[PDB]
């Protein structure tokens, strides 16, 4: 009989753990029923968008394994992800290749 809530909602992230972390961390006194389902759907979408952009850069540098340089390039080349992760330092990431034009010969 024991089905998980994630299989019922058709998701990959847990719903039971999100509900436990909402009830345990002092956000409000009651927590509803659709709140962990909505929040697990949102977190799954954001994770899928980041990893979809990162795997393409791992292809472009001809690799089969993602590293923080590839995560850095994927975040900083996108527009709205660069506004979401605006003041965030990613460890072992480096910078983008920018040279000003008046310095070039």
């Amino acid at each position: 009989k024991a089905k998980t809530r994630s299989s019922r909602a058709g998701l990959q992230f847990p719903v039971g753990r999100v509900h436990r972390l909402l009830r345990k961390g002092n956000y409000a006194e009651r927590v509803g029923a659709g709140a962990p389902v909505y929040l697990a759907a949102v977190l799954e979408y954001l994770t899928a968008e980041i990893l979809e952009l990162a795997g393409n850069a791992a292809r472009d540098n001809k690799k089969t394994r993602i590293i923080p340089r590839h995560l850095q390039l994927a975040v900083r080349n996108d527009e709205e992800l660069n506004k979401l992760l605006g003041r965030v330092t990613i460890a072992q990431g480096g910078v983008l290749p920018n040279i000003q034009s008046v310095l070039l010969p």
Binding site: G93, V95, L96, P97, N98, I99, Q100, L103, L104, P105
Partner: protein, 97 residues
């Protein structure tokens, strides 16, 4: 006999250091600096290793972003060479001093 015109090795070092991802400060002098300026807050502290690595990551990222904004100030003044009043202008517009 063979010498490059001044500017060429500067440009290719710019490309070489923007291509890699590594730590650009030696780490035993940085560890001694951290322990020294932490000694004036609590005597006989005992750092881990990942704590010193996290501090070195954060400090390197801060200095690189400050140098980018300093370079934009120096280009705005119609120069190429960076001077310390550019650093002062950047840190005062940003909201730090």
């Amino acid at each position: 006999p063979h010498r490059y015109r001044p500017g060429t090795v500067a440009l290719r070092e710019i490309r070489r250091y923007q291509k890699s991802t590594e730590l650009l400060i030696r780490k035993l002098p940085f560890q001694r600096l951290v322990r020294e300026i932490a000694q004036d807050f609590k005597t006989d502290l005992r750092f881990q290793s990942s704590a010193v690595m996290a501090l070195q990551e954060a400090s390197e990222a801060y200095l690189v972003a400050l140098f980018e904004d300093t370079n934009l100030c120096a280009i705005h003044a119609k120069r190429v060479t960076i001077m310390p009043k550019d650093i002062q202008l950047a840190r005062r517009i940003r909201g730090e001093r």
